[PDB]
Amino acid sequence: KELKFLVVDDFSTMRRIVRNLLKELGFNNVEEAEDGVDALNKLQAGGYGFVISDWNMPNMDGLELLKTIRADGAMSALPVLMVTAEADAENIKALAQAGASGYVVKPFTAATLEEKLNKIFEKLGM
Amino acid sequence: KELKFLVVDDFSTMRRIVRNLLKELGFNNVEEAEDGVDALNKLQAGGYGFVISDWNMPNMDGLELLKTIRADGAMSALPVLMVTAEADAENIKALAQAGASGYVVKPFTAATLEEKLNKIFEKLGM
Amino acid sequence: ELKFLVVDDFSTMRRIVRNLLKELGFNNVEEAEDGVDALNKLQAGGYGFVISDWNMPNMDGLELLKTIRADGAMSALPVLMVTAEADAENIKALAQAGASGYVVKPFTAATLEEKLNKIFEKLGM
Amino acid sequence: ELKFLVVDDFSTMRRIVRNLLKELGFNNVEEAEDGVDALNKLQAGGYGFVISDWNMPNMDGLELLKTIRADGAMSALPVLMVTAEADAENIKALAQAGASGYVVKPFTAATLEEKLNKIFEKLGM
């Protein structure tokens, strides 16, 4: 619950929605970023334990952000939950190939988010 | 607070000095490790919330231990304070790139250790 | 349109750069995975701009830049170096080796465009 | 002087193993990133010892060991397998595949030395 989250999306409203659903679940340590670039700049500052990122964003999208994090020795194993608007078979496979910790289709509820977070925490042993 | 610390250094005298300075600051939950291998073995057991490690150690030194911790899913965000003999610009940049939560030059006082601890606590949202 | 050669051993970064260039209207882009691979392609001629990362195996960015500048057949080729750290040390070596400019990664399309615009303007392009 | 090849996709671990060998007096060490890279490297020739991690992309440790043993030119090559756990099942598989020995990471220079000496003795080296 004290874990530091970074919520990434270029639409402020969707970021505020995710931040509040997190709050609803008991997670109050949350930061926000506008795209893959802004996010990497924040993650390099350190302290983050979980990233929630949207699939489509300007400059550097979710998949590109994920691949970059996975290749960085300072944060290679950082949990990344990808938010997508549709669960496309290719997408799901791409996400799997790229090392995503999991994915969630939007719009989602606090309940769907909770189940997704618990599965990831268990798999990683947190 | 009773955050569980792991103090890592091959010199028993330094480990005992750091443990005592933490006691002076109010942290009484503290374990010790002799080098990075021993530390990793302990961290695998889980339960730790902060690591203070010396730069120079046989088998696996501070930087190698830090890099190994950051490559682990659960310990991605585990705070790691690196203790070093001199604040050399090369070391510091290496530390930052590897994801160290901070560093402190020895010998240090309880006051200095408290300042470093607070900066890292603020950085993580604790 | 101006043919670009994007060089980086990290395939993901090459795609990001190629995407941003296309966003800026440059569709004539090729990729190379290191300095040696880049030089093999540059030999054919036809390239008008090179964007290279600083750290690559076989031949790194600084070494690639020096080789280009020393080659009479392409000594004035514009080269934009991508770096992770805007270290004053690095900036010195880059200018000394003759980089047309540099950009720190990660970067946005806007920053890339500004960097390109500064080089184009300087060369009268 | 025996030429070692250290294989692991985690670069930090390759450097650690290389540092331990140097400490034990073994200075002739090369590195590979996975099973496929290792096999390509073994082609250049002159290798006398392989230390590989159990889990790597493209070709893991078990598959690398199996390939080495199925190649007549290198069927006698010593192979020390590094694992995260001494799972008896894994140890059974390692014995079946012809591993020279195994070591659980993380490990110390003393443990490594003990493992290498055991293999050396057993191999008449």
Domain CATH number, residue D91 = 3.40.50.2300
All residues at 6 or more sequence positions from A66 whose CB lies less than 8 Å from its CB, including other chains = A53, A80, A82, A95, A98, A99, A100
Residue with tokens 């691979």: C37
Our measurement of the distance from residue C48's CA atom to the centroid of its chain's CA atoms, rounded to an integer in Å, reads: 11
Chain C residue at shortest CA distance from A39: C106
Q: Identify whether the C-beta of residue D71 lies closer than 8 Å to the C-beta of residue D27.
A: no
Among A59, A67, A68, select the one facing C108 at the smallest CB separation.
Answer: A59
Longest CA–CA separation in chain C, Å:
35
Rounded (5°) CA angle A59-A62-A67? 100
- Rounded Cα distance, B97 and D103, in Å: 30
Q: ω before A79 within 30° of 0 (cis)?
A: no
- Three-state DSSP at A28 gives coil
C9 is in an annotated binding site: yes
- Rounded Cα distance, C82 and C61, in Å: 9
CA-to-CA dists, residue B82 to B51, B74, B95, angstroms: 8, 20, 8
Distance from CA of A89 to the nearest CA of C (A): 21
Check B77 against A4: CB less than 8 A apart: yes
State whether residue D89 sits within 8 Å of chain B by CB: no
Q: Identify whether the C-beta of residue B100 lies closer than 8 Å to the C-beta of residue B67.
A: no
CA-to-CA dists, residue C121 to C69, C111, D95, angstroms: 20, 15, 68
Q: What are phi and psi of D32, to 5 degrees?
A: -140, 150
Among A2, A45, A77, select the one facing B76 at the smallest CB separation.
Answer: A77
Strands (E), D3-120: 4-7, 29-32, 49-53, 79-83, 101-104
Burial class (CB in 10 A: 0-12, 13-18, 19+), D8: buried
Among B58, B59, B68, select the one facing D12 at the smallest CB separation.
Answer: B68
Q: Which residues of D are annotated as a binding site for Mg(2+)?
A: 8-9, 53, 55
- Rounded Cα distance, B59 and D102, in Å: 18
* E strand or H helix at C120: helix C109-123
The technique by which this structure was obtained is: X-ray
- Rounded Cα distance, D39 and B81, in Å: 40
Residue with tokens 């770096």: C83
Range of the domain at B7: 1-126
Q: ω before D106 within 30° of 0 (cis)?
A: yes
* Overall resolution, Å: 1.9
Q: Nearest to residue C3, comparing CAs of C51, C68, C50, C48?
A: C48
Burial class (CB in 10 A: 0-12, 13-18, 19+), C75: exposed
Given its phi and psi angles, is residue D52 left (phi above 0), alpha (psi -120 to 50 degrees) or beta? beta
Structural domain count of chain B? 1
Q: Identify whether the C-beta of residue B83 lies closer than 8 Å to the C-beta of residue B106.
A: yes
CA-to-CA dists, residue C55 to B62, C33, C63, C90, D30, angstroms: 25, 11, 10, 12, 20
Chains that touch C (3 or more CB pairs under 8 A): A
Q: Nearest to residue A46, comparing CAs of B87, B114, B83, B96?
A: B96
Q: What are phi and psi of D50, to 5 degrees?
A: -125, 135
CB < 8 Å to B48, chain A: none
Number of other residues whose CB lies within 10 A of the CB of residue B78: 20
**Interface B:D, ≥3 CB–CB pairs < 8 Å:** yes
* E strand or H helix at A80: strand A80-84
What residue type is assigned to position D70 of the chain?
A: A
CB < 8 Å to C18, chain A: none
Token pair belonging to D15: 């450097």
B54 is in an annotated binding site: yes
- Rounded Cα distance, C29 and C16, in Å: 12
State whether residue A64 sits within 8 Å of chain C by CB: yes
Among B73, B125, B126, select the one facing A124 at the smallest CB separation.
Answer: B73
Token pair belonging to B10: 């091959």
